[PDB]
Amino acid sequence: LRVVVTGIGIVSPLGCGKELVWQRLIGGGSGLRRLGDDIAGELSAKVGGTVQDVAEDPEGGFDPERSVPHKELRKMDRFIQMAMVAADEALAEAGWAPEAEQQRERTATVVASGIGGFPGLAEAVRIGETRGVRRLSPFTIPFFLSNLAAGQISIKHRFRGPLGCPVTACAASVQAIGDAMRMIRTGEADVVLAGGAEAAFDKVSLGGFAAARALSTGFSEEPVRASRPFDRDRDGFVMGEGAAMVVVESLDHALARGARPIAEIIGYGTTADAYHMTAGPDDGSGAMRAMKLALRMGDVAPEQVDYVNAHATSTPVGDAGEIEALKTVFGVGAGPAISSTKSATGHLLGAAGAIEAAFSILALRDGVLPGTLNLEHPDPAADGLDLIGPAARHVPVEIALSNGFGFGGVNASVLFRRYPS
Amino acid sequence: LRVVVTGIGIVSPLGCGKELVWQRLIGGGSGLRRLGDDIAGELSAKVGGTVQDVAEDPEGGFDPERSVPHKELRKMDRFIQMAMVAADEALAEAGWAPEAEQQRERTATVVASGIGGFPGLAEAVRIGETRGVRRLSPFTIPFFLSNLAAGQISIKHRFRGPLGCPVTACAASVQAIGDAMRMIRTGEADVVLAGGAEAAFDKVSLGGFAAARALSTGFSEEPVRASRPFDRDRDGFVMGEGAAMVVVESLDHALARGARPIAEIIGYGTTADAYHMTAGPDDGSGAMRAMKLALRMGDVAPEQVDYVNAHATSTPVGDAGEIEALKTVFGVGAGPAISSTKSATGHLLGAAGAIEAAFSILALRDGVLPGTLNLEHPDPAADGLDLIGPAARHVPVEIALSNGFGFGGVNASVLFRRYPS
Ligand code: NA
Ligand code: NA
Structure with a gap:
């Protein structure tokens, strides 16, 4: 179905x-x-x-x-x-x-x-x-x-x-x-x-x-x-x-x-880090696996993803883990446009997943990718990832991924396609 | 599977x-x-x-x-x-x-x-x-x-x-x-x-x-x-x-x-009462529906259920609701042997489901149905239900049902069969 x-x-x-x-x-x-x-x-x-x-x-x-x-x-x-x-x-x-x-x-x-x-x-x-x-x-x-x-x-x-x-x-x-x-x-x-x-x-x-x-x-x-x-x-x-x-x-x-x-x-994919009670692993491997399971379920290659609404909550260690995970899944130099709307809303914790899914769906509906406010000096570790700066990007897109990577090592990713296809 | x-x-x-x-x-x-x-x-x-x-x-x-x-x-x-x-x-x-x-x-x-x-x-x-x-x-x-x-x-x-x-x-x-x-x-x-x-x-x-x-x-x-x-x-x-x-x-x-x-x-079946925030309906209709979904999934007629580990937590209103639900599913005069092990353990709340599933599985394994301690004068509303008294019943059995009916109108029932069949 x-x-x-x-x-x-x-x-x-x-x-x-x-x-x-x-x-x-x-x-x-x-x-x-x-x-x-x-x-x-x-x-x-x-x-x-x-x-x-x-x-x-x-x-x-x-x-x-x-x-x-x-x-x-x-x-x-x-x-x-x-x-x-x-x-x-x-x-x-x-x-x-x-x-x-x-x-x-x-x-x-x-x-x-x-x-x-x-x-x-x-x-x-x-x-x-x-x-x-x-x-x-x-x-x-x-x-x-x-x-x-x-x-x-x-x-x-x-x-x-x-x-x-x-x-x-x-x-x-x-x-x-x-x-x-x-x-x-x-x-x-x-x-x-x-x-x-x-x-x-x-x-x-x-x-x-x-x-x-x-x-x-x-x-x-x-x-x-x-x-x-x-x-x-x-x-x-x-x-x-x-x-x-x-x-x-x-x-x-x-x-x-x-x-x-x-x-x-x-x-949709969900995994556990089985690593530490609040921090994820530095290589982002649990988050990586969850993204890959979502893509595999969607029969979507990494290069077909237009937009990623990242988990990134503005932590030194957490954001760096997700950066590593994104590089693993998507490579560098091409790949999806990536932003975190937590820059504007803050971290809604248990409600972050749903609001960021809503933003990913609307990005697809209207052909507008939210920017990351405050992104003034991107982490050098992200060089080669297409991070969207503070201004929204108006481009038609078809496939969006949204991530949530929580305390207790719980990782979940959900993948949407524009309707009609 | x-x-x-x-x-x-x-x-x-x-x-x-x-x-x-x-x-x-x-x-x-x-x-x-x-x-x-x-x-x-x-x-x-x-x-x-x-x-x-x-x-x-x-x-x-x-x-x-x-x-x-x-x-x-x-x-x-x-x-x-x-x-x-x-x-x-x-x-x-x-x-x-x-x-x-x-x-x-x-x-x-x-x-x-x-x-x-x-x-x-x-x-x-x-x-x-x-x-x-x-x-x-x-x-x-x-x-x-x-x-x-x-x-x-x-x-x-x-x-x-x-x-x-x-x-x-x-x-x-x-x-x-x-x-x-x-x-x-x-x-x-x-x-x-x-x-x-x-x-x-x-x-x-x-x-x-x-x-x-x-x-x-x-x-x-x-x-x-x-x-x-x-x-x-x-x-x-x-x-x-x-x-x-x-x-x-x-x-x-x-x-x-x-x-x-x-x-x-x-x-397995789960339903919502959509009735009241802590109390279930007097006819037990949400609990009834959850039991029926479990039976339907198991391709088991009500008369084939040997044992029910009831939710019954020792409340005047809650136990009466489950009694009504049991009568609806199983009828009166025959039906399964029914007990609540909360009589012995108390109500483990979120852990009740798992411990009572464990007790239902062991009942099947060993052919012993736990009794209901303290059952000295059963509710007249249960007349015709085979309620097990304080002493365990030693009988070979093949099919057991266990119920959990919680605050916020959440009902869940799980059905087990003895292995090998
Ligand atoms: Na997100
Ligand atoms: Na039970």
Whole structure:
């Protein structure tokens, strides 16, 4: 079975609504901002990709009350609220709103998160220390459980097929998409709402990454400059929040119901480094293998790939590992155009896979390849890779690859083809 | 492809080592104990299924130093340490210890958890409130991330195929097994180490369930009596901790390498209620559909099922929902023998799926069906279901079904056949 995407939804540091987000992205916009002191006051990591409200962003702000009654918002952590908005958008685009149980039973919901309800969990622990555990809300556990993003989406739309929640860090929502494709192919679902949601900002989660020296600290006075994948002066990732969702279904199923395919999913590969608990190997060999499996599934030679939306999160070691992996798969001197949109959004962790898949699909749809903001002095190790600089590249393209290479050595790559071919 | 299990590992409230655990189970033993005041002092829920150390249980105690150097234990939360011990056991039984990269690249690691590193997370939040976030360990994030159970297992054994971490609550490690089977069938792995691990005891997590009135409170003076699935006087679940793992591979692959199949996996189904965020529907319709999908995959009529290891966690509403679902699938007056081993272990949450799959497989291997401890007055709604009382039933059987029906409306059922058939 050929598998397609028929709808996309985004909640991001560049706004809500995928067309608005895409436009801001391609026009050179950034979602990086100074974090509140309540989150970053004690840390030298001061910058984040934050999702703004409608007071701050009238056209593209995040208002979860449009998706969920105010009363029910109290029952769900921020990442879930974002998941709900993004899912509404993707499902509206796809026109998938089954009323009959037959089709509801064939709809799967697969929504990843790397950290899940960290703010909710942290608050509950703080209440325990101050007020006592006897004082906890009855909604405490489902407020934060990672699977309640998919859960609340399923409950709203009455999706009664398989539910999934892959919690595999920065690869998580790349796996959500591969998992969705797999279920369409095994016949376990006809439609999958697949994606990721992350809203993990808290002094302890940021503090935790900061203790690992994982975060950018050198650009607090000019936040937009902090995320600089592949750049000589990168000094750690910039945490981001948001959600992105795709509707995945067979081409036959899409055409039978009159849904227009936005792009085709032609390959997926996932591997484990089995090397170290947070850092990948210097040669990028696990990431290399995952890319090759995606290409092999797609029957696509490396030289046929037009665009790669790299994982590169702006870490000295991580970006260098992916550079090595890209060189191994694609060679040097020709090969695909390569950029990291984390330069603009920051690192959405479990939601990075889905938003970067959305950006890869839109690159194909419109013939525009996002640039890498802040790429002022590329790493000499990348010489010979066609790294796209800060300005987007307007060129017609047919095949795009997107990578997610996460903590615990989890690597996932997904490959898309423009529709029609 | 026919899919088999070739090894099993268990860390549980009845001990470590699946043969010891099985023996204690079938002899009528309980893992329920009074919790320390540091966990349950402020709560009227005082009983848990706890994993004991070797001082307390010389023959079956938990000693993670046999799996991991003391130095490296500091880098991993309790659930991960349990996952490591259980995985070592299952892999030793299966004799799967690939040295060549070819076979390492074909080994997947799929390990579920419902809550993951709650104790680690809670401690980090407490340190943040007392010492400051500047004081956090550099290991803070990977210490608790749910995917680091599979991650650490992968790193030790050099498993370089797909990594998964389904965080779908009480269904989670039933899904891990279904997901493993799916990958063998798609050709994405030749061997999968699949299971779940949970070690979530903390005053806040217990406090959270207690706030939902989800926990047993009426049997603190006789802890062994607290978990009583299907019984008239059940008053909420008893939280448990542990890990269980299975090695999953094709029958052809097992026989080619001289590994002995312990049982065959013949069916798997998973559904979503799309009804409410913690409670299932009163008619058990999502659970019903998941059972039917497993049976349909196995080409097994309801009347051919010999044994069901029920989800039933000892809740008034949950156990009644599963009763309704069982009646729908199997009818009344004949049907399978049905028990819940949560009566003895408590509710292992994300690890329940794997330990109860292990118990179902051993039931088939040895012709012994575990009883339901504490079943003194069965729910009248179950009249006509063959509920097994407190004593194990010694009968030869061929087909077993095991259910996991979790928070967020996630239902999963897995179906096994005795080997040879
Ligand atoms: Na990417
Ligand atoms: Na069960």
